[PDB]
Amino acid sequence: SGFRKMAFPSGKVEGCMVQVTCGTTTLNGLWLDDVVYCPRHVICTSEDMLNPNYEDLLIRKSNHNFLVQAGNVQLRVIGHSMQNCVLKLKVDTANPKTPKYKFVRIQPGQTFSVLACYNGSPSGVYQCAMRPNFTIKGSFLNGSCGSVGFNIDYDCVSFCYMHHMELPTGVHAGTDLEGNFYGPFVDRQTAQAAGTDTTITVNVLAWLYAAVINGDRWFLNRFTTTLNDFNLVAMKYNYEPLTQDHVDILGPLSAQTGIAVLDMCASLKELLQNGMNGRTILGSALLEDEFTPFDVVRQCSGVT
Amino acid sequence: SGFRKMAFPSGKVEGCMVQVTCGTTTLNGLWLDDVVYCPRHVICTSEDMLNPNYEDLLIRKSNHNFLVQAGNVQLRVIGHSMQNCVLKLKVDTANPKTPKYKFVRIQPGQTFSVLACYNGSPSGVYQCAMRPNFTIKGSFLNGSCGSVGFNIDYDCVSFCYMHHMELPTGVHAGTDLEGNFYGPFVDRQTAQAAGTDTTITVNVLAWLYAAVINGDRWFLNRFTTTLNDFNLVAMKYNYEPLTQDHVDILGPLSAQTGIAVLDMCASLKELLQNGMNGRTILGSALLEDEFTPFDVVRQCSGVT
Ligand SMILES: O=C(Cc1cccc(Cl)c1)Nc1ncn2ccccc12
Numbered sequence: 330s331g332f333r334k335m336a337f338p339s340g341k342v343e344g345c346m347v348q349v350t351c352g353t354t355t356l357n358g359l360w361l362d363d364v365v366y367c368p369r370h371v372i373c374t375s376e377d378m379l380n381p382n383y384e385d386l387l388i389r390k391s392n393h394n395f396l397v398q399a400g401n402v403q404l405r406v407i408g409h410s411m412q413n414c415v416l417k418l419k420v421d422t423a424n425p426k427t428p429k430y431k432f433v434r435i436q437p438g439q440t441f442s443v444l445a446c447y448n449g450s451p452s453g454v455y456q457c458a459m460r461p462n463f464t465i466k467g468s469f470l471n472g473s474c475g476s477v478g479f480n481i482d483y484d485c486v487s488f489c490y491m492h493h494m495e496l497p498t499g500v501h502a503g504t505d506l507e508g509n510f511y512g513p514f515v516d517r518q519t520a521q522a523a524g525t526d527t528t529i530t531v532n533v534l535a536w537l538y539a540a541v542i543n544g545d546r547w548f549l550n551r552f553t554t555t556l557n558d559f560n561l562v563a564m565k566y567n568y569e570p571l572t573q574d575h576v577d578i579l580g581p582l583s584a585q586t587g588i589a590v591l592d593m594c595a596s597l598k599e600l601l602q603n604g605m606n607g608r609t610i611l612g613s614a615l616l617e618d619e620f621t622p623f624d625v626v627r628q629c630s631g632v633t
Numbered sequence: 634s635g636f637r638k639m640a641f642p643s644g645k646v647e648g649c650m651v652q653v654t655c656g657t658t659t660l661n662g663l664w665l666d667d668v669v670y671c672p673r674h675v676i677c678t679s680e681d682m683l684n685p686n687y688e689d690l691l692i693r694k695s696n697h698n699f700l701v702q703a704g705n706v707q708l709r710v711i712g713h714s715m716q717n718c719v720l721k722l723k724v725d726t727a728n729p730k731t732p733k734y735k736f737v738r739i740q741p742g743q744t745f746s747v748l749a750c751y752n753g754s755p756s757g758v759y760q761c762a763m764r765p766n767f768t769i770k771g772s773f774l775n776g777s778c779g780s781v782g783f784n785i786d787y788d789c790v791s792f793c794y795m796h797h798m799e800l801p802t803g804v805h806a807g808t809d810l811e812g813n814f815y816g817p818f819v820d821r822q823t824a825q826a827a828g829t830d831t832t833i834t835v836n837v838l839a840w841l842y843a844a845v846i847n848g849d850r851w852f853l854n855r856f857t858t859t860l861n862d863f864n865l866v867a868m869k870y871n872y873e874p875l876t877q878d879h880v881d882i883l884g885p886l887s888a889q890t891g892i893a894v895l896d897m898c899a900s901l902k903e904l905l906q907n908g909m910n911g912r913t914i915l916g917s918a919l920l921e922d923e924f925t926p927f928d929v930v931r932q933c934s935g936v937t
């Protein structure tokens with residue numbers, strides 16, 4: 330019992346973190362096999378960030394300008410290429426600690442763990458989600474770029490995020506491991522506003538199922554609703570519309586608790602309309618949306 | 634910017650997790666040098682837990698009855714001893730992944746990371762705190778016993794907690810790595826109630842400083858208070874009394890923000906008396922007390 334914002338164990342990812350320095354800029358890189366992946370803005374000076382032409386800036390860079398250090402030993406760079414917004418630095422040594430891995434591009438609403446790093450060294454691990462506006466609410470300081478987001482399935486690490494930028498609003502933007510930004514963001518120091526940060530409805534429902542499983546049941550009511558009726562309320566409260574795909578994904582949680590998905594929707598509807606009235610659910614005074622249905626089952630069943 | 638419930642990177646601790654089986658019970662063990670530490674209730678059957686005499690139960694156990702597996706390879710047990718509520722299983726092989734370590738006994742209000750494990754394999758990592766009633770609000774299922782709590786200072790892991798038990802109220806009790814329970818709990822299946830779970834005032838103040846540093850400033854008021862006046866309010870709201878030792882520990886956060894500790898106390902006093910009025914601080918609708926002043930500085934400065 331108990332329900333925590335839990336991150337994946339970070340060991341497999343810690344073994345991949347390296348420091349990348351180009352000119353006077355230093356950030357993190359991810360060393361998998363004989364390649365080091367890092368944000369391409371490592372080639373920029375702070376002045377360059379205003380309007381950078383990465384292709385032109387890269388012409389002035391050779392393999393020996395990319396300093397890659399793994400722990401306290403230097404890696405030899407034998408090739409470099411730019412793929413979208415990331416640089417791939419080919420090194421002469423395969424990372425002996427390379428775990429089984431995949432590069433995945435996640436959808437909004439999906440959660441992942443972040444291993445925040447500075448100078449190629451891990452500072453901490455936390456759980457977050459790809460927001461519906463394609464930002465992440467992380468915790469990142471200057472030098473954290475190149476830190477990655479990932480999920481783990483037994484022994485395979487699926488890398489889904491590489492940190493690139495903080496928007497003026499303190500939210501974060503980044504790419505998948507192919508260098509494509511999530512959302513419309515560009516690696517340029519230009520004020521870019523994020524869209525509406527809507528609530529991930531299916532995740533709130535999963536968290537409500539987690540609460541019932543862990544004993545918090547005060548919010549369960551005698552009502553039911555329909556997808557269309559629920560969605561009228563979700564629109565009013567800036568929640569994502571719930572689809573039958575979402576209802577299907579909540580099937581195992583519905584089966585575990587004996588609470589039909591539409592009945593849980595009716596509980597959520599009353600919580601949206603009435604508020605919590607000073608009460609809490611799983612130690613929270615707001616509706617939590619950064620646990621997916623898969624996360625709830627995983628935590629409540631102890632997958633290792 | 635951004636402020637997250639952040640755990641330490643768990644790699645150094647993942648390298649120490651092993652499975653311990655005795656009879657039909659299986660739990661986790663912590664392998665440091667040539668010793669494996671685990672809860673002594675590994676020798677009990679589910680029936681034994683009602684009223685166990687551990688010394689008597691241990692007489693029927695020999696080295697070969699303790700099955701210790703590290704990954705997929707078996708460790709040879711060459712000695713066993715009971716120290717308070719933990720067993721120390723001497724093995725014939727030193728753990729090659731033993732990090733620099735210390736065993737510490739923490740005080741209530743102090744935070745640590747937990748690497749939840751099942752069958753000697755890590756499932757996840759989360760941050761928690763030793764509550765003032767000496768319980769922890771963790772996330773643990775059957776088989777999670779032996780999972781540990783720890784802090785890290787650069788390359789040294791300070792182990793502070795080993796999970797032993799869930800109370801009927803869904804909160805958790807455990808020992809330090811010398812086998813002494815935190816609080817009055819005993820490793821016996823007897824209903825043991827926890828005392829008042831008071832709020833860790835100094836941690837709430839640290840989190841309010843973190844909020845100001847990260848831009849959330851709506852709660853700052855034009856008032857000040859005294860330690861005695863503040864403490865009258867803290868008593869009323871089941872908050873721990875604030876001492877000059879706490880004020881001293883908040884000095885660096887006070888200096889960083891230019892907000893005198895007693896002025897921040899007056900902001901906290903108004904938040905206690907008036908509530909949040911539907912507003913949030915650092916994405917929370919309640920006052921968070923599981924970040925110490927050291928945690929806030931560490932996260933806001935990027936210590937690796
Ligand atoms: O934002 C950047 C780097 C950057 C700057 C301009 C454009 C791009 Cl593409 C990238 N890093 C970052 N992440 C969290 N942070 C918190 C405080 C300061 C910086 C910072």
Ligand SMILES: O=C(Cc1cccc(Cl)c1)Nc1ncn2ccccc12
Pocket residue numbers: 330674682773774775776777778797798799800819820821822
């Ligand atoms: O409580 C125990 C084991 C135990 C039982 C009785 C006395 C002692 Cl000393 C220890 N493990 C545990 N921790 C979280 N859990 C969640 C669901 C079931 C069990 C469980």
